[PDB]
Amino acid sequence: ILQHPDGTVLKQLQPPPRGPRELEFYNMVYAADCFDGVLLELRKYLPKYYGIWSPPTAPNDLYLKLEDVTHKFNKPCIMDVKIGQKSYDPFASSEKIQQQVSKYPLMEEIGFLVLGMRVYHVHSDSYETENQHYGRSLTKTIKDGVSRFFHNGYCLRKDAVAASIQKIEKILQWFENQKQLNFYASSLLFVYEGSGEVEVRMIDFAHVFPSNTIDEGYVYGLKHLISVLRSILDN
Numbered sequence: 589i590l591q592h593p594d595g596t597v598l599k600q601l602q603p604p605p606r607g608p609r610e611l612e613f614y615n616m617v618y619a620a621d622c623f624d625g626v627l628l629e630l631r632k633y634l635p636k637y638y639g640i641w642s643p644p645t646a647p648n649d650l651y652l653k654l655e656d657v658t659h660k661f662n663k664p665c666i667m668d669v670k671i672g673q674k675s676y677d678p679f680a681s682s683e684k685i686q687q688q689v690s691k692y693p694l695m696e697e698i699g700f701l702v703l704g705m706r707v708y709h710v711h712s713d714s715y716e717t718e719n720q721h722y723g724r725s726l727t728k729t730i731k732d733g734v735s736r737f738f739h740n741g742y743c744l745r746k747d748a749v750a751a752s753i754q755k756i757e758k759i760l761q762w763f764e765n766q767k768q769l770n771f772y773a774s775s776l777l778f779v780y781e782g783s784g785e786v787e788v789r790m791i792d793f794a795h796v797f798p799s800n801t802i803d804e805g806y807v808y809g810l811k812h813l814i815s816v817l818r819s820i821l822d823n
């Protein structure tokens with residue numbers, strides 16, 4: 589992820605097959621001729637897509653040019669949350685499944701994993717950063733683990749918590765009204781202002797597949813994340 593001063597990000601395509609699949613996803617959704625009602629609504633929850641980009645002298649070096657969802661913030665507080673019961677996709681090998689489940693064996697139980705957060709503290713005029721190991725350490729501590737993101741401005745930011753719930757609810761509504769796509773190892777990016785208040789966007793589409801059914805695992809995760817955020821409002 590290269591943050592570009594024009595309010596876009598450049599995401600380098602992952603190695604195959606993951607990078608190509610993500611390019612394919614954005615191309616399907618943001619097709620110039622697409623009038624699929626489901627996919628039209630889905631665009632609302634994605635970063636805007638500006639097509640494939642490569643350096644003038646390096647056509648090999650493929651990027652997606654995406655909206656920087658943090659652009660409109662002064663001191664953005666950012667959290668990435670992987671959603672779903674399974675982080676492996678429907679065509680993973682036994683080896684590959686074991687790799688993925690071992691990273692977070694509570695994924696089935698909890699249905700989401702905090703990949704990281706950056707939290708601005710007014711207090712000290714500085715950022716607090718948590719990495720992959722933070723979220724992977726949370727057990728059924730998850731409430732306190734998520735709460736940490738919302739400690740800003742000499743308070744618990746229940747405004748940002750409530751905003752996040754309302755925006756996730758829209759994404760949840762989309763997932764309850766579609767059975768065309770299932771999403772594995774994809775994330776929600778949360779942004780609020782740490783200095784019309786919150787951003788929640790779906791990101792990371794290297795394991796999105798056509799489907800016949802509700803994405804039950806994703807829905808479980810969204811529902812559970814909402815339930816946790818809901819409980820934080822009672823703090």
Ligand SMILES: c1ccc(-c2onc3ccc(-c4nnn[nH]4)cc23)cc1
Pocket residue numbers: 589591597599635654655656657658666777791792793
């Ligand atoms: C820090 C962290 C994330 C961002 C960010 O802002 N807009 C984004 C759009 C997409 C992605 C993305 N897609 N796939 N993986 N990451 C990240 C984005 C900015 C700063």
